[PDB]
Amino acid sequence: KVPPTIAQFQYTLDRNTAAETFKLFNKYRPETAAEKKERLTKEAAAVAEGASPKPYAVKYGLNHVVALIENKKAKLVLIANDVDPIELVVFLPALCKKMGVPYAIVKGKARLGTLVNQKTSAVAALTEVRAEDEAALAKLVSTIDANFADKYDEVKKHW
Amino acid sequence: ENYQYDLWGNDHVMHLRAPKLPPPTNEESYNPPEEYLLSPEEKEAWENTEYSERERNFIPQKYSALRKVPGYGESIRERFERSLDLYLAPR
Amino acid sequence: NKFVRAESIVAKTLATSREKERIKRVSILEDKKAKNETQHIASGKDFILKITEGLIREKTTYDGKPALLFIVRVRGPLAVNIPNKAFKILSLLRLVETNTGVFVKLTKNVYPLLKVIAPYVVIGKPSLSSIRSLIQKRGRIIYKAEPHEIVLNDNNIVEEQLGDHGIICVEDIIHEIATMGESFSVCNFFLQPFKLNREVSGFGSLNRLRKIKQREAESRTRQFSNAATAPVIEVDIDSL
Amino acid sequence: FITRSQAVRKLQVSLADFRRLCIFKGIYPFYYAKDIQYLMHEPVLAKFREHKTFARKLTRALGRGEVSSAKRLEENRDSYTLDHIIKERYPSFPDAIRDIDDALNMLFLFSNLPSTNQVSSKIINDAQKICNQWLAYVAKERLVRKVFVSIKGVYYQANIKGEEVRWLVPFKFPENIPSDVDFRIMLTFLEFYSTLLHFVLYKLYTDSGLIYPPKLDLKKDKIISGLSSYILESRYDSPVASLFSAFVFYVSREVPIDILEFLILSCGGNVISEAAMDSKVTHQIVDRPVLKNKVAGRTYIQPQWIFDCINKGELVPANKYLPGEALPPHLSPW
RNA sequence: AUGGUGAA
RNA sequence: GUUCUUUGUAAAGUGCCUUCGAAGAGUCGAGUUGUUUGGGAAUGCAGCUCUAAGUGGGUGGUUCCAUCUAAAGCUAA
RNA sequence: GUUUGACCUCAAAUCAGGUAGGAGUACCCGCUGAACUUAUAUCAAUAAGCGGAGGAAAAGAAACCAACCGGGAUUGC
């Protein structure tokens, strides 16, 4: 068997909840290299011949996400269940629970990487969202909480 | 700007042969003399015989008027066979 | 069969309810307009919208003069089940199958039906060259029981079928359809309307991207106004 | 010799790609080792490898869920060119003119082919444009010499530089495409012949002092689109080309205006069509069994008259070409 | 002693 | 020296006021078995049971004080 | 979807761009290492053998030396 901290993963969200979460995340795909490059070239061309709001994107860096957590700025955190150095992610669920930041465990790091234009993303978290999706973000947070903390309240028990 | 330059302004090798072109028509006129109109008994034999080993790929017919000439859906098969023979000819 | 989820059922129900409300409102408005009780309605005069390539919108009224129109199925909306009111109209024109198209005569009595079936199909006035090409490229003649739908092949078959009205060749049918001939209604019904090939007609790496691009362009080119007095949208059928 | 599987393994290329390369290079079989080894140096193999790499990358991008990346990759991609492969197979223009027979046959067959899933409408449109260009050039030069209406179609012979190349054109009736024919093989020949005909048409237009590619008459393209609609801008040898000089003909509905208009234009006549509507004609081409108009100002004739005149260059009297009477037997001109 | 050579 | 370029709300330094303010673990150490020195506190090095804290830990002399911050690396004379 | 594609892993290429072998060896840096020779001590952390680079090599900017009015990388006399 495995200690209680191990096997906490693999108790991922159901099909519908995971699909809804990925659908919501797909609306905030960070601009790829080509998109950013073309935008910068267009801006340069406009400047050559002669005020945008804060951009919205999903924060995914492991160090960046961990920094976002413990400051209560992050609202939703997605955790990969197939991280080869498990020690890099063993502490994330407990840290999120202590900080109160909602969190979920999703199947596959490649799935997280796909929504962030990366081969493999260890974690994916959201800090700020548009007012249109604020209600959707709250609904997803509530659904994730109900389906993870209550449904899998024993995830931290029974080795 | 493609196709805007003259390319000119080959089978003489002993181990290379040119692709032979098909022969002329074989009296497949839409309005041929009545002699070319094959009899029903011989037309039945032509129809029954196997394909690709036939003297002709058509049955000449005596059509009353030009406007009465029908279509020809077998041209696609003939062109496909010609294309196959073009690259499947052990010269 | 495969399990049916609740999201699809709910979406279909909502879309069908919206379509039914739109159809009911349009039919009620058209019936009142026909009754000449135009005292209190959004608009009385008919409108036809022409959209062409960049895109330019032209709004023109509809006159009583007969006109030639070509209609092609679009298979939309995605989550809208065809209602009975639209089902009857589609069955009358036997355009249920996707990509199917037929020629109809534009009349005042046909404008309400065209408005009703506007989202489901794309309409327009083709040129003589387009009509001739479409007729000479595809066609069907029902031949003897008569379970055969062999493609049109011989002019003599045309003589055998109709014969009486001088329709002895495909060009006669082309003239009768393009021109406002007496036999326009008779020939069109017997013509077994064409089954146009789908646009992409492929699946794969490049095919998927091409289909996605075509779908994206379709939304911009075609729109569902859903208004009670929504003008009939016309596109350049000659391109197709 | 080396077996086909052995040659494919040596080329480490897909079977379809290997067949495409063989068709392009004209290799024939069980193939000679030297020929296959030489074929490995063709850039077309590198282009096919690049296409495979692009296909796998595009599939990866689409599966990942990034449409923008796939669109950018597709936009940046470029298709291979057959311009240089033509020269090696046809070192001299006369060889290309001689071989143009099969190219013209295939292009004309595909032009009338209806759009289907196997072949996109773009290829058919390009083939139709090429056929229109060729027909316009032939009509301007009046190189048509032999016409033979047959069950297969009308066998044309254009004396391009005196090479009297014979080509066939099927009728305009709808064709029921059989499932036996594999369009994948035919598509390679279609592309090769399209490129060859493009180059040959450009060369011919340059030789004749004509701008290529000419535009198309838009107003005619909405009525009688075809050979007549393709206007050409620049910037005798035989009686056949001089027949019906300054002559105006009235083509009826039944007659194949498409076939007749080309012949009349090549000879030097003029065509007035009733269908274009949807006066000063010396002859009217009609095919009705009985006609009621019967105007003394028009000499009703049948297409067999024009066919025989072109075949023999005789301008034969109309004594046996009136409407409502049997035409003389039509014989092979060769 | 260390490092190598040969051998009825 | 001669010059051609500079580039952009770009970079750096000092004093003052405010808010923060992170340091290397099978590692030290103890135990045990061998090696090293002429080295009395075998320090140092070698196998292995065990194995810690951060106002902490190491090195020393006096009932407190003195110095440093190991378990990462580069550098010509 | 009885199906496609991704992440991870494992292999092949006479594929493209790269490097180590060995020699030399007075000096250096580590392993290993005896006897003659003298009353554990001593020849001796030497001789020989093994591995690694240079024109020098190692070390080098303190968990240092000190108990003084404190000094302040290593290196050699």
What is the total residue count of chain A? 159
Span between the terminal Cα atoms of chain C, in Å: 38
| Nucleic strand G under 7 Å from the C-beta of D71 | no
User: What's the CA gap between D29 and B82, in Å, rounded?
Assistant: 17
Those residues with Cβ within 8 angstroms of residue B83's Cβ, 6 or more apart along the chain or in another chain: D106, D185, D186, D189
3-class secondary structure per residue, chain C: CCCCCHHHHHHHHHHHHHHHHHHHHHHHHHHHHHCCCCCCCCCCCCEEEEEECCCEEEEEECCCCCEEEEEEECCCCCCCCCCHHHHHHHHHCCCCCCCEEEEEEECHHHHHHHHHCCCCEEEECCCHHHHHHHHHHCCCCCECCCCECCCCCCHHHHHHHCCCCCCCCHHHHHHHHHCCCCCHHHHHHHCCCCECCCCCCCCCHHHHHHHHHHHHHHHHHCCCCCCCCCCEEEECCCCC
Q: Which residues of D181-195 are buried (b: 16+ CB within 10 A; e: fewer)?
A: bebebbbbbbbbbbb
Which residue of D58, D171, D172, D173 to mutate against C (max C Cβ within 10 Å)?
D173
Contact (CB, 8 A) for A30 and A117 = yes
Resolution in A: 3.5
Residue to mutate among C135, C151, C153, C156, with most B CBs inside 10 A, is C156
- Please report which helix (H) or strand (E) contains residue B40, including its range: helix B40-48
Q: State the alpha helices, DSSP H only, in chain D.
A: 4-11, 15-25, 33-39, 43-64, 67-76, 83-89, 93-111, 121-141, 183-207, 218-221, 239-242, 257-267, 303-312
Is there a contact between D271 and D260 (Cβ–Cβ < 8 Å)?
yes
Domain ranges of chain A: 1-159
Angle value at C-alpha C12, between C7 and C14, nearest 5 degrees: 95
Q: For residue A54, how many C-alpha atoms fall within 13 Å in the half-sphere facing its CB?
A: 8
Q: Name the residue ranges covered by the structural domains of chain B.
A: 16-89
> Does strand G come within 7 Å of the CB of D65?
no
Q: Are D58 and C209 in contact (CB under 8 A)?
A: yes
Q: What is the DSSP string of D124-148?
A: HHHHHHHHHHHHHHHHHHT-EEEEE
Q: How many CB atoms lie within 10 A of CB B74?
A: 16
| Residue C155 near chain B (CB below 8 Å) | yes
Please check whether residue D152 is in contact with residue D105, taking contact to mean a CB–CB distance below 8 angstroms.
no
Residue of D nearest to B74 (CA): D152
Q: Which of B26, B33, B77 comes nearest D178 by C-beta?
A: B77
The partner residue sitting opposite B75, judged by closest CB among D86, D170, D326, is D170
Q: How far, CA to CA in Å, does A130 sit from each of A55, A114, A144, D279, D296? A: 10, 22, 19, 73, 83
SS3 D1: coil
Q: How far is the CA of C87 from the C1' of G49 (A)?
A: 101
The reply to whether D59 has its C-beta less than 7 Å from any atom of strand G is yes
Backbone φ and ψ of B46, nearest 5°: -60, -45
D149, β-bridge pairs: D154
Identify the three-state secondary structure at position D301: strand
CA distance D207 to D204: 5
Does the bond joining D213 to the residue before it have cis omega, within 30 degrees of 0?
A: yes
Contacts of C166 in chain B (CB under 8 A): none
* CA distances, C40 to each of A11, A65, C29, C32, C33 (Å): 62, 61, 10, 10, 10
D73 at the A interface (CB within 8 A)? no
Instruction: From chain A, pick out residues whose CB is under 8 angstroms from the CB of D71.
Output: none
Bases in strand G with any atom closer than 7 Å to a protein CB: 1, 4-8
Which is nearest to D177 in space by CA: B80, C209, B45, A70? B80
Chains that touch B (3 or more CB pairs under 8 A): C, D
- Alpha carbons B61 and B34: distance in angstroms, whole number: 8
Q: From the Cβ of C2, is strand G under 7 Å away?
A: yes
Residue D294 DSSP SS3: coil
Task: Find out whether C99 and C198 touch, Cβ atoms under 8 Å.
Answer: yes
- The CA–CA distances, whole Å, from D81 to B44, C201, D11, D85, D191 equal 50, 26, 20, 8, 10
Instruction: Give the CATH superfamily of A1-159.
Output: Ribosomal protein L30/S12 (3.30.1330.30)
C-alpha count within 13 angstroms, C-beta hemisphere, residue D281: 20
> Hey, what's the torsion of the CAs at D47, D52, D54, D56, to 10 degrees?
-170
Q: Is D149 helix (H, G, I), strand (E, B) or coil?
A: strand
For chain D, say whether B54 makes contact (Cβ under 8 Å). Answer: no
- CA angle B11/B17/B18 to nearest 5° reads 75
Question: What token pair was written down for D304?
Answer: 């067999």
Beta bridge partners of C59: C49
Spatial distance from the CA of D222 to the C1' of G18 (Å): 66
| CA distances in angstroms from A34 to A40, C210, D60, D158, D219, listed in the order given | 10, 20, 16, 53, 44
Q: What are phi and psi of A104, to 5 degrees?
A: -145, 155
B23: Cα separation from own chain's centroid: 8
SS3 assignment, position A112 = helix
CB contact under 8 A, A35 and D68: yes
Per the listing, tokens 């032209």 go with: C58
CA of D9 to C1' of G1 (A): 34
Touch between chain B and chain A: 3 or more Cβ pairs under 8 Å: no
Minimal CA separation from C165 to chain B, in Å: 17
Distance D164 CA to F12 C1' (A): 85
CA atoms within 13 A on the CB side of A53: 5
CA distance linking residue C190 with residue C193, whole number of Å: 8
The torsion of the CA quartet A47, A50, A54, A57, rounded to 10 degrees, works out to -50
Q: What end-to-end distance do the CA atoms of chain B give, in Å?
A: 38
Whether CB of A120 is under 7 Å from strand G: the answer is yes
The residue of chain B with its CA nearest to that of D193 is: B83
C70-104 burial by CB neighbour count: b if 16+ within 10 A, else e? bbbbbeeeeebebbebbeebbeebebeeebbbbbb
Element (H, E) at D165: strand D165-169
Residue B45 burial class via C-beta count within 10 angstroms: exposed 0-12, middle 13-18, buried 19 and up: exposed
Q: Are D163 and D97 in contact (CB under 8 A)?
A: yes
Q: Are B71 and D177 in contact (CB under 8 A)?
A: no
D66:A34 CB<8 A? no
- Report the distance separating Cα D229 and Cα D221, nearest Å: 5
Q: Chains B and C: how many Cβ contacts under 8 Å?
A: 14
Q: Which amino acid is at C53?
A: E
DSSP codes, A116-159: TTSS--SEEEE----HHHHHHHHHHHHHHHIIIIITTTTTTS--
Tell me the one-letter amino acid at D33. A
Asked if C101 contacts C196 with a C-beta cutoff of 8 angstroms, the reply is yes
Beta bridge partners of A106: A80
Backbone angles phi, psi at D124, to 5 degrees: -65, -40
Which residues 54-113 of chain A have a CB under 7 Å from nucleic chain G? 84, 108-110, 113
Beta-carbon pairs below 8 A across chains A and D: 16
Method: cryo-EM
- Look up residue C228 and give its two tokens: 């009670």
Using the beta-carbon criterion (under 8 Å), do B82 and D332 form an inter-chain contact?
no
Preceding omega of C77 cis (within 30 degrees of 0): yes
SS3 state of residue D156:
strand
